[PDB]
Amino acid sequence: LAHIFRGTFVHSTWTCPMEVLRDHLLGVSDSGKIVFLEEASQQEKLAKEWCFKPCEIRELSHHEFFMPGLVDTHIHASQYSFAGSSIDLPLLEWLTKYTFPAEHRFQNIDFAEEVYTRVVRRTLKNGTTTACYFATIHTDSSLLLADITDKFGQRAFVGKVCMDLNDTFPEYKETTEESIKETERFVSEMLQKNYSRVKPIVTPRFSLSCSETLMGELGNIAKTRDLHIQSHISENRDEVEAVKNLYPSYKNYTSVYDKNNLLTNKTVMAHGCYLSAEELNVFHERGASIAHCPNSNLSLSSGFLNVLEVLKHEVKIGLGTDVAGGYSYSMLDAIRRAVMVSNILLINKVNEKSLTLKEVFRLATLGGSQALGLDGEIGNFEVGKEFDAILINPKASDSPIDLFYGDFFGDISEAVIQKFLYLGDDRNIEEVYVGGKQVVPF
Amino acid sequence: LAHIFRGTFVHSTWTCPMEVLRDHLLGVSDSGKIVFLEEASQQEKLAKEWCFKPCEIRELSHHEFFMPGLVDTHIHASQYSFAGSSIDLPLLEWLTKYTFPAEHRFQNIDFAEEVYTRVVRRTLKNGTTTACYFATIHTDSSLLLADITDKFGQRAFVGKVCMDLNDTFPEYKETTEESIKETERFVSEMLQKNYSRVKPIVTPRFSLSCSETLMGELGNIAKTRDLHIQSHISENRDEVEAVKNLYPSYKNYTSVYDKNNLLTNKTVMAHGCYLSAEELNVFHERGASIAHCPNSNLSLSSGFLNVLEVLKHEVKIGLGTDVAGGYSYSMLDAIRRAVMVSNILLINKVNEKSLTLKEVFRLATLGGSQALGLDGEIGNFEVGKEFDAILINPKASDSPIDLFYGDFFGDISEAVIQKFLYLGDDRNIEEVYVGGKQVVPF
Ligand SMILES: CC(C)[C@H](N)C(=O)OCCOCn1cnc2c(=O)[nH]c(N)nc21
Ligand SMILES: CC(C)[C@H](N)C(=O)OCCOCn1cnc2c(=O)[nH]c(N)nc21
Ligand SMILES: [Zn+2]
Ligand SMILES: [Zn+2]
């Protein structure tokens, strides 16, 4: 056994949005798997079965708790250099003014190295143990990202972006053939590295930047290598209308992807704000997933995803930060913003209720893992799963949270857990484990 | 002279939402006033006029800047103990379930001391140099808050809350006569202490907790002592309708206050989400102000204040955190949420545009100071004003912000300033000055 921990564990299950396991014992194997999880009353029994001494057990402080690692289902690693600025002009203006020039710089491998090192370190330290990254159109810089994530021990999908259409910034695109060849090369080189927890993902940027021909070939590569696919869908009203006019023969945005083999049981689509009920039924039937990106949706004045309607349709859904469209790199920010979007829908009388903080906590961990096809391996504390987890200390040095005796003995349930979700930050994250290995501190 | 600083200063003016003054020299007197502000080319001249040596000048790091202190126009100091929890059930449910029991504990002076010490230290360290506090109905605990704020050197209005109606938690109220006598005592004792920058403010909680009789007498006390008034107005639809049914003889919520001498040129009202155009004209004509509390308005599913409409009506407006209805104690959070509310109005097509980050920055500093009647003394860097300011270091130890060479030499304007406003936190606030005195570090 690599670790045995005693203390409080907080996670989600499909039948319980937030389950708090107090004074429990958890064991993690050498291979990084959770091998037991039981009440501490079972110490003697476990110590015999698993051959360990009581002195080998790490006891958490009385006010600390473990929770599962946060899962970021959509982030543009390549836009991190300007995250927290701009976020004003509209989205085609924006893409042209900020985004495409920033991504064009990734033709320089040394620039790539600086930005990607910073983004992987920053998200890990904020407790993002699994990330689904968009990189750039450049195969070699996108391979460097994969190598960086492996070095740091973060779990990740890395996607070389494809685009053969780009009218507003023509310096930043590939020919159709180039896009196909470079994707084939990216995937082969990724498979050659054989990284234990970093895999390639097929990434048409979106339907407006990829021809039918390209889309269809990317779909074939995904099928033949059995890979995940990631793209954007129905993020704003102008995009919805642009697609309608560039692809008039398709019934809706969803059909454009579906008929081109881009909507599979291993597909995740960012945004989804303007998907209709009919389109959600198609997501459900195909096993495709949505990455809810609430900060970006408000920051860029895009729209509101109706998460309650998505859940009613039994569509798989996780949370994403959508850096740099969303200005925050934090999944704690994404959780807060998700609660707020659901409240917006209640205020506007679209829905009759809002999402609870606990339901959103489940989206950020188990929901996200399900959205990326990883919920057999991660997302909560179940025997069999990889130990992807973060040790939270609400009383850490310089903590942004003020705890009072009432938070432990008063009349508000999960008071401390809720204050961490609403007020905490990286100062409260003392340790981060991915695959049972301690990755933070670095 | 107490200080002379050389470097970058960022502030608002009425004609410019964000003015960046690079390599400037600023002098602060012994009395805490700004005595000069000029380009550093004037060093020799100023050194002679004001009798100081070049070695006496404090040079800011090349990546640091001063900005004015943040002004929190509305916060319930007494609810800080449960901030970051709860925030789920509706507002009368909430008031009954969480708020009134928490405020009832302030009958214990030792409890008051702990909560109020923590809140004043926390807001100061987050750069809130001026705060307009609601305390509790207890005169002695509310006087302790005033004393605490004085000890720490924060500028503040402190308001003993009045309520003689409380059907849902009758243990927490005063009789009408008691309310009047205790307000008179609070004000007298505040004036006896003679604090240099902490003043009393008359505080009927809101029309639903104060009888006509009470409201009218509070209005007389304000008039006769020439005091500010603070209350809540038109925060949610149910409140609007409750007022209509408890005060059927008044034309609208605004009239209830106005006809009872509670709407004056020294009045600030929190929320205002459901004020009509006619009511805003009355605010404008009386000189009364609004405290925009966007985090609380979304957190409690209340509504959206249309800030563009408020500005179009030339109504005075600042920002507030509304702890604990809003879960964050940070004015940086309030700035971010304000931008987001204006974007909500653009997405819903109520407005044709949103507020810029710069306009919201102006609300958080100069707008707020104007809302509290203090814009002759604070809110920006102008000769004559008190030096209320915060030194920002975006590269501080453990900074949440990653700076890149491009933020200083690229094509995005005020990149660094914007990253601090969107991503910064208390780690970026190195020093806080109120009245020219350094109050942080403590
Ligand atoms: C007129 C329309 C075509 C509209 N202005 C438009 O082009 O929408 C673009 C955004 O669609 C998805 N998308 C593609 N790349 C990105 C991207 O990099 N970030 C985000 N948030 N969305 C993206
Ligand atoms: C049915 C209605 C009367 C409705 N449920 C209601 O009572 O609204 C109450 C909120 O009005 C203003 N208010 C009074 N005290 C507070 C308070 O402590 N926090 C906030 N955010 N608002 C407050
Ligand atoms: Zn995106
Ligand atoms: Zn309030």
**A60 with A10: CB under 8 angstroms?**
no
Quick one: which of B349, B344, B280 has its CA closest to B309? B280
Nearest in space to B264 (alpha carbons), one of B208, B211, B225, B214:
B225
Locate all alpha helices (DSSP H) within A56-175, ordered by sequence.
91-94, 100-104, 109-125, 139-152
- Cα dihedral B111, B117, B122, B123 sign: positive
Phi and psi for B79 in degrees, rounded to 5? -95, 0
CA dihedral A86, A91, A96, A102 (to 10 degrees): 50
DSSP per-residue letters across A241-266: HHHHHH-TTSSSHHHHHHTTT--STT
CATH number of the domain that residue B53 is part of: 2.30.40.10
CA–CA separation, A215 and A229 (whole Å): 11
The amino acid at A430 = E
Q: Which helix (H) or strand (E) holds B267?
A: strand B267-271
Q: Does B304 touch chain A (CB under 8 A)?
A: yes
Please tell me if residue A425 touches chain B, with a CB cutoff of 8 Å: yes
Are A3 and A59 part of one and the same domain? Answer: yes
Q: How is residue B63 annotated by DSSP? A: T
Distance CA(B97)–CA(B91), nearest Å, equals: 9
Residue corresponding to tokens 């003889």: B249
Count of Cβ atoms closer than 10 Å to residue A248 Cβ: 7
Q: Fill in the amino acid letter for B194.
A: N
- SS3 of residue B392 by DSSP: strand
Distance A296 CA to ligand 3 centre (A): 8
Tally of CA atoms within 13 A in the half-sphere of A368 that contains its CB: 34
Q: Which of B80, B82, B86, B119 to mutate to test the interface with A (most CBs of A within 10 A)?
A: B82
**Torsion angle, alpha carbons of A234, A236, A240, A243, to 10:** -90
Give the type of residue at B172. Y
Helix or strand (DSSP H, E) at A337: helix A331-347
Residue pair B281/B314 in contact by the 8 Å Cβ criterion: no
- How many other CB atoms sit within 10 Å of the CB of residue B290? 30
Lookup result for tokens 């904020």: A126
Distance CA(B258)–CA(B212), nearest Å, equals 12
Residue A366 contacts residue A375 (beta carbons within 8 Å) = yes
Task: Report d(CA A55, CA A4) in Å as an integer.
Answer: 10
Beta strands in A340-403 (DSSP E): 389-392
Report the phi/psi class of residue B160: left, alpha or beta, with left for phi > 0 and alpha for psi in -120 to 50.
beta
Last residue in a domain, options A337, A364, A379: A379
The sign of the dihedral angle between the CA atoms of B191, B189, B127, B344 is negative
Q: State how far the Cα of A291 lies from the Cα of A133, in Å rounded to an integer.
A: 12
The domain tally of chain B equals 2
How does DSSP classify residue A33?
A: B
Question: Distance from the CA of A91 to the center of ligand 1, in angstroms?
Answer: 6
CA B364 – CA B359 distance, rounded (Å) = 9
Q: Is the CB of B197 under 6 A from ligand 2?
A: no
Would the CB atoms of A299 and B343 count as touching at under 8 Å? Answer: yes
From residue B325, give the alpha-carbon distance in Å to each of A147, B83, B88, B265, B300: 45, 8, 10, 26, 7
CA-nearest of B398, B425, B149, B391 to A401 is B425
User: From the CB of residue B405, how many other CB atoms can be counted at a distance below 10 Å?
Assistant: 10
Closest CA to B367 of B381, B379, B382: B379
Strand (E) or helix (H) holding A224: helix A212-225
Widest distance between CA atoms in chain A? 69
In this structure, the answer to whether residues B253 and B392 fall within a common structural domain is: no
| Residue indicated by tokens 């209720």 | A353
Same domain, B107 and B64: no
Dihedral angle at the C-alpha atoms of B370, B372, B375, B377, nearest 10 degrees?
A: -170
- The Cα–Cα gap between A362 and A365 comes to 5
Beta-bridge partner residues of B38? B25
Residues 6+ apart with CB under 8 A from B375: B366, B369
User: What is A385-424 written as a DSSP string?
Assistant: SB--EEEE-TT-TT-S----THHHHSSSTTHHHHHHHHH-
Measure the CA–CA gap between B324 and B320, rounded to whole angstroms. 11
* φ/ψ of residue B319, rounded to 5: -110, 155
Clarify whether residues A61 and A203 are in a common domain. Answer: no
Token couple for B211: 């009888």
Closest ligand relative to B92 C-alpha = 2
What is the experimental resolution, given in Å to one decimal place? 2.0
Element (H, E) at A19: strand A19-28
* Other C-beta atoms lying within 10 Å of the C-beta of residue A130: 28
Nearest to A283 by CA among A377, A291, A227, A341: A291
Angle value at C-alpha B30, between B29 and B36, nearest 5 degrees: 0
Task: Answer yes or no: is B231 a known binding residue.
Answer: no
Q: Do A419 and B85 touch (CB under 8 A)?
A: yes
Asked if A365 contacts A386 with a C-beta cutoff of 8 angstroms, the reply is no
Nearest one of A286, A292, A297 to A311, comparing CA atoms:
A292
Determine the Cα–Cα distance for residues A179 and A164; give it in Å rounded to an integer.
Answer: 7
- With vertex at residue B363, the alpha carbon angle to CA B362 and CA B369, rounded to the nearest 5 degrees, is 100
Residue A341's φ and ψ, nearest 5 degrees, are -60, -40
- Annotated binding residue at B74? yes
Cα B86 from Cα A75, distance rounded (Å):
30
Q: What span, in angstroms and rounded, lies between the C-alpha atoms of B434 and A107?
A: 49
Last residue of a domain, one of B359, B379, B399: B379
Which position has the token pair 């507003």? A168
Which pair of tokens denotes residue A335? 């959780």
Asked if residues A433 and A439 have their Cβ atoms less than 8 Å apart, the reply is yes
d(CA B360, CA B380): 14
B101 touching A, CB under 8 A?
Answer: yes
| CA A247/CA A243 separation, integer angstroms | 6
- Contact of A78 with chain B, judged by CB distance below 8 Å, is answered with no
| A199 touches A142 (CB < 8 A) | no
Residue finishing a domain among A355, A379, A403: A379
Helix (H, G, I), strand (E, B) or coil at A197: coil
Is there a binding annotation on residue B234? yes
Residues in CB range of A277: below 8 A, 6 or more apart: A309, A313
Task: For strands A289-292 and A267-271, give the pairing.
Answer: parallel
Cβ(B125)–Cβ(B439) below 8 Å = no
CB of A364 closer than 8 Å to CB of A127: no
Torsion of CA B324, B326, B332, B335, to 10 degrees: -150
DSSP state of B57: P
Indicate if B362 and B271 belong to the same structural domain. Answer: yes
**CATH code, domain with B145:** 3.20.20.140
CA distances from A307 to A313, A350, B94, B288 (A): 10, 12, 25, 40
- The residue contributing the CA closest to ligand 1 atom 5 is A92
Of A214, A224, A123, A227, the closest CA to residue A166 belongs to: A214
Structural contact between residues A142 and A135, judged by C-beta atoms closer than 8 angstroms: yes
Q: B348 CB near a chain A CB, below 8 Å?
A: yes
DSSP letter for B349, please. T
Q: What secondary structure, in 3-state letters, does B63-95 show? A: CCEEEECEEEEEEEHHHHHHCCCCCCCCHHHHH
Computed from CA positions of residues A235, A241, A242, A245, in that sequence, does the dihedral angle turn out positive or negative? Answer: positive
For A330, the token pair is: 């934090």
What the block records as the tokens of A194 is: 């054989």
Cα dihedral A127, A130, A134, A140 in deg (nearest 10)? 100
Q: Are residues B214 and B356 both part of a single domain?
A: yes
Give the C-alpha separation, B382 to B49, whole Å: 18
* Nearest atom of ligand 1 to the alpha carbon of A296: 21
B164 in Cβ contact with B176 (< 8 Å)? yes
Phi, psi of B430 (to 5 degrees): -85, -40
User: B414: helix, coil or strand?
Assistant: coil
Distance linking the first and last C-alpha atoms of chain A: 22
Question: B103: Cβ below 6 Å to ligand 2?
Answer: no
- Rounded Cα–Cα distance for residues B254 and B276 (Å): 10
- The helix or strand, by DSSP H or E, that contains position B190, with its residue range, turns out to be helix B176-193
The helix/strand/coil state of A7 is: strand
Chain B interface, mutation test: which of A117, A296, A332, A347, most B Cβ atoms within 10 Å? Answer: A347
Does residue B233 sit in the same domain as residue B348?
yes
Q: Which ligand 2 atom minimizes the distance to the CA of B242?
A: 3
Q: What is the largest CA-CA distance in chain B?
A: 69
How many Cα neighbours within 13 Å face the side chain of B93? 7
R_g of chain A computed on alpha carbons: 22
**Residue B110: how many CA atoms within 13 Å on its side-chain side?**
0
Residues A87 and A46 grouped into a single domain: no
Instruction: Give the integer Cα–Cα distance in Å for A344 and A351.
Output: 9
Mutation to probe ligand 1, out of A95, A166, A169, A296 (largest number of atoms < 8 A from CB): A95
Query: Within this chain, do residues A362 and A398 fall inside the same structural domain, yes or no?
Result: no
If asked whether residues B355 and B403 sit together in one domain, one would say no
Beta-bridge mates of residue A232: A270
From CA A312, how far away is CA A355, in angstroms rounded? 12
- Could you please report the per-residue DSSP string of B343-394? HHHHHTTSSSS---HHHHHHIIIIIHHHHTT-TTTSSS--TTSB--EEEE-T
A344 touches chain B (CB under 8 A): yes
A54 touches chain B (CB under 8 A): no
The CB of B279 under 6 Å from ligand 2? The reply is: no
DSSP state of B352: S
- For the Cβ of B64 lying below 6 angstroms from any atom of ligand 2, the answer is no
Closest by CA to A155, choosing from A69, A233, A267, is A69
Query: Which of B74, B91, B161, B209 to mutate for ligand 2's pocket (most ligand atoms within 8 Å of CB)?
Result: B91
DSSP string, A273-319: TT--HHHHHHHHHHT-EEEE-HHHHHHTT-----HHHHHHTT-EEEE
Pair B402, B257 in one domain: no
Residue B437, min C-alpha distance to chain A (Å): 23
CA distance B156 to A74: 43
End-to-end CA distance of chain B: 22
Q: What kind and span of H or E run contains B254? A: helix B253-258
Q: Token digits for B234?
A: 């038109």
Residue with token string 């990883």: A374
Chain A contact present for B376, CB below 8 A: no
- C-beta B206 within 6 A of ligand 2: yes
Residue A108 and residue B315: Cα distance in Å, rounded? Answer: 52
Q: Cβ(B134)–Cβ(B106) under 8 Å?
A: no
Pocket of ligand 1, beta carbon within 6 A: A 76, 91-92, 95, 99, 205-206, 208, 232, 235-236, 238-239, 242, 296, 322, 325
Quick one: closest CA in A to B426, which residue?
A400
Structural tokens at position B383 = 């000769």
- Cross-strand bridge partners of residue A97: none
For residues A338-370, b (16+ Cβ closer than 10 Å) or e, as one string? bbbbbbbbbbeeebeebbebbbbbbbbbbbbbb
Range of the domain at B118: 69-379
Give yes or no: residues B55 and B187 share one domain.
Answer: no
> How many Cβ atoms are within 10 Å of A14's Cβ, its own excluded?
11
Among A216, A310, A315, CA closest to A265: A315
